[model samples]
Target: QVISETFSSGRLNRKQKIGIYKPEKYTDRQAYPLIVVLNAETLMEPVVSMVRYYEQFGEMPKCIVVGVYEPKQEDVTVVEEVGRPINESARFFEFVSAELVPYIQGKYPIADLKGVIASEEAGFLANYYMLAEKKPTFNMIVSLNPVALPRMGEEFSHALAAGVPNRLFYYMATADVENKVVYDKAIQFERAMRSAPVHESVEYHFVDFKGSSVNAAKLQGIAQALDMCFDIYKPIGGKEFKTQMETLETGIYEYLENKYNTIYKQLGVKKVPILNDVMATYTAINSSQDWESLKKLAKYVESNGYLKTAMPNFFLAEYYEKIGDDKKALKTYQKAYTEPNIDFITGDLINERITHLQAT
Candidate 1:
């Protein structure tokens, strides 16, 4: 049975609605391990919108979800580094620690067991929390197309060294054309983590939903992640053990920018340029900076036939660096990091520009 209700948190003064599911034959005598699935960048309702996930995997362990929603219609800010959510991510960390977990333990016959937190784009916030925060509550984190590109590797390295106990299952669908850059950075982060001495406790799973739609990707990704969680953590149930991917209906993304913005600024980073600038501006420093104007500037750069040249790409790399996509920033920096060219608009200018951007 699915139980849905809203509770008033005196701390935040908000009536947050949460969803809890109980599988058939579930008993209170023996506490079950709980999996907390967070919602993407919008409201919390979607956590339970499609009950099929529970229908198929209920045989595993009873899952409880604390769906954290954005305050209103505010858009999530894009972190230039690591593609992560900063300020709002911290708030979510508070919700899980201060409000949600206490409530779950108080109300349910659950073990003092490790919990699982899962999300997508905005869900990237939860994944960040799992890695960066101290006393992280979740034992595992499952992120689909995690929006971490920039400097997330350093943070992950720190988290691992701190001895954070958790397994990670990451899902990246090939059709998510918009986030390829960040996804590539995530792959790098995974590699760095695996190479570290402390990463054996972490399991990295990559999902390639090459030809499927967004919906198909979510279904297959979640099922695969859940299976991996069982394999590593061995929660409550024996195991679902499905060899093939299963498709289901669930949409993801949105919410959690306040935390990103606040923390990023706290860490001395800046906001990413608007998505349009990121896509249009390339190698030429002045032309790429022109992305801020957006109308006449972009047109002029395109009309000048600069779009096809390597210049715009070169400048964009600097742009990403200034904002904080450090992994990308660093990768791009290496391209021209040591090239001995220092002219007005050629080698010297490029090296100087790249160094300036990365220093930020």
Candidate 2:
């Protein structure tokens, strides 16, 4: 599931183990998002496995995950009073932003989205990303069961109050079983974080799984965070069609338009509209007999992935055929045949329609 590598670092000043995971059918032409596992020994497995599971269901996109192995606890342990990196943790912080991130950039076709997974003593790491005086390093931060000081919440509220330059997604997860050791005043940390003065650029999500144990909570929380992060990537499945699309009356095209609008906002990547989703959009339009939406969907497909194929013109021709413009339908379908065939829309298929229209 993971390929191993060892990187010699001038930043960490030590050779460290690195683990890399690429999605199925991973290719060099496309750029995928990146997730760097801070505590690779344990978190690496589940994060990779969960992403793989999410991708298969079309719930998430393929991502490139880089796991940095076995960072010493002392390197991640931050001084709680300042709630910032100092001494060894300072070096560790730079190691990730400077040496490691560049190394990843040089090696892979990484997209704009980046994340780091941290827990326990390393939990305070999330603070530096937002509270820093300058732009933050990662867009998505998951701080689970952090052992940071209680004021950690106040620290974030103030920084958020000051404002951030770019979009940041801050997610945290906590469990109750551990009693106050790390969990004590856990509510103190959880409650205060949400109190941060609202900002347009910052999005916050938190979960407290009261009954779950810490060990299991780790996976559960990360899963929830990732799911929320990539919610837009999902295709129109049976559930989406039955519940969301079946009632379509207006703005049929707007629904598809808004879906990818948010997709770009959240993922920071231009999505190549999938065949299934575009086709489903067309189907939902036809169900409502929203003839105008067919024209919109056709032009939308022409600008998206189906541009090189007959899919776009075919949809446009179908739109004309449905709205009682047989002349336009025949010509549009003729134009469709000029492009390469796609799925069931073949040259033979187009020719048969052309022949029938001539007879009429």
Candidate 3:
């Protein structure tokens, strides 16, 4: 559920109205990514809805979403000549990074993954957060239909070229149907950024929607940016598994381990390997007849909390059976039959294996 609240920032000497959204199943025990939305007055609902939709499909992790309200006209004064923030606007930026972010972290257990979403003028302003020399607070920046000044592009492009130690996600979208002047400058900005020497850790994407309205482009950009940002968390597909695993010379189990490890290292999200992913690794191990990989898979599943289910024992039993230990296979399958069913490892399957072992 999303709750509305107000944050009084001493830095800005003002009380800012903010909207906060926590996943329906939020818990203190687990950490979540933080997403700060600018132009919250109109953009908050769309961003929150998209976050929930992606979380439902397990495409993205649950996030603590906060929206800062700013009127469209008021946003103009925030950025002065040469696309620099001064006076009140400077205070607002500090309010977000120093005061607001720290306050949110104090109240909720937030993960290392932090992002900012903004549109139009505020979208252009969002880029400045990336140039912070003192370790950028937001690793992800989603800018939609921004009204960027062409000159400012060079500055930001240089920042992207310099690169940071951690992963950086930058997604921007512009529609040709919007104000022609802004759209043209955005194209120039995109070119400048693309020309820069970006690091491998930096994931930058730009989309030019030909016939879409400004608002439509903004909404679509949000969805696309999020999908790309959390792409690593999604379960492995059939074709992907076949292509990557079928030709493996060795370390099928290690491939699965590294995939999840990359997810944690890049996205700051730690999730148990999905059943289909584990099963895919199991199949690859058997296809290669890699007994060592099978043993590793069994231990990986067991230590990672699949022990209570039929998965670990079923794989362990298969490993034993493949190694010509019928007695051990029969005993392990018997133990698996008593556990809760998961995926293909049902009691019926275990009993079928047991019958085959007894007959042997």
Candidate 4:
């Protein structure tokens, strides 16, 4: 499940341990999200195993996980002196951006939604990515039990207040039993977090593991982070349908298009639009009897995920019927009758429609 690699870094000027995990039968057919885990000596196996669990049942997409083993304290520590990663830490940061990631991209078809997870000093260091001058290298940042500098919290709050430039996830965790001083400081930091208006582009989550140890916080935080990070990728739910689709006065199909567009923009997944979501959009179309939406969705599905199924012609026929064109609808249904059935588009259903249209 884990493939090992040794990467010699020019920035850090040393050979470092790197662990890679690719999905079974990995190929370039679809891009996989990339996760960079720091402190791999203790964090690698657990992250790898948990990633597999989430991806197994479609809760998460299959991803490529790479863990970097950083054993030195200086490589991941931040000081109030600079209010940021410095010296050795700066070198390590540049390595991740200028070296390690480019190396990974060279070997794999990586997606745009890159993420990073770390604990303690490394966790604290991961936040520097958000403050980069340009777009951050990692869009998703998971920091657990971070050994943060006193003002670094305020630094983050200030940056978040300024406005997040693009879609990003910021997950931070605290545990009392790990270090009471750090835990208390984290509460103070979280207070400042509330003081500012975080941009809508930034998805932020803060968790207090209540007296869980540092190790416990790290493990639990990763699980929670992965869940929320990919929440948008899930199928259309009852709540979404009621709130977004059912209430739409028009442009029901546009709403569906925007949803998938947002998914790609945020997650970097050129997702083969899920079957359930497409079907849900069709249901919404029926409710409004919007022939415009129906016709658009017919061509949309043809080029999207249902091209091989009877869905394309069947939907077009439905669109024709909705517009009171029975002769054209009959011809469309006849075409669907010879195509393969999918879900509710059974050949029997197409035959019935054909017979009825012929009689009329």
Every model's TM-score: 0.51, 0.89, 0.91, 0.94
Against the reference, the lDDT scores of all candidates come to 0.47, 0.81, 0.85, 0.85
Model 4, 200-292: lDDT tens digits are: 888889998886887888889989998899877777888999889978868999988987788789889877777888888888888877779
Tens digits of per-residue lDDT for model 3, 210-232:
98888888999999999999999
Candidate ranking (lDDT, best to worst): 3, 4, 2, 1
Model 4, CA-based lDDT: 0.85
Q: Give the runs in model 1 whose Cα sits over 4 Å from its true position.
A: 10-13, 40-59, 65-78, 81-87, 132-134, 165-198, 232-360
- Each candidate structure's count of clashing pairs: 35, 1, 0, 0
lDDT of 1 by residue, 1-360 (tens): 456677676544567666666655666655645556655333233433433354353323344445444332212233565355445544545666677777787876655344444444444555555554556566556665555544556666556655644343333332354545655665675566445455555545556555455455665666665555543222122122111101111110001123223323221222232322223222222333433333333334334444543343444455565565767755654664444332233655666766765677
Off by over 4 Å in 2: 161-166, 242-248, 322-326, 338-360
The C-alpha local distance difference test score for the whole of candidate 2 amounts to: 0.81
After TM-score superposition, the amount by which residue 133's alpha carbon in candidate 1 deviates from its true location, in angstroms, is: 5.8
lDDT of 3: 0.85
Clashing pairs in 3: none
> Which pairs in model 2 have colliding backbones?
180-184
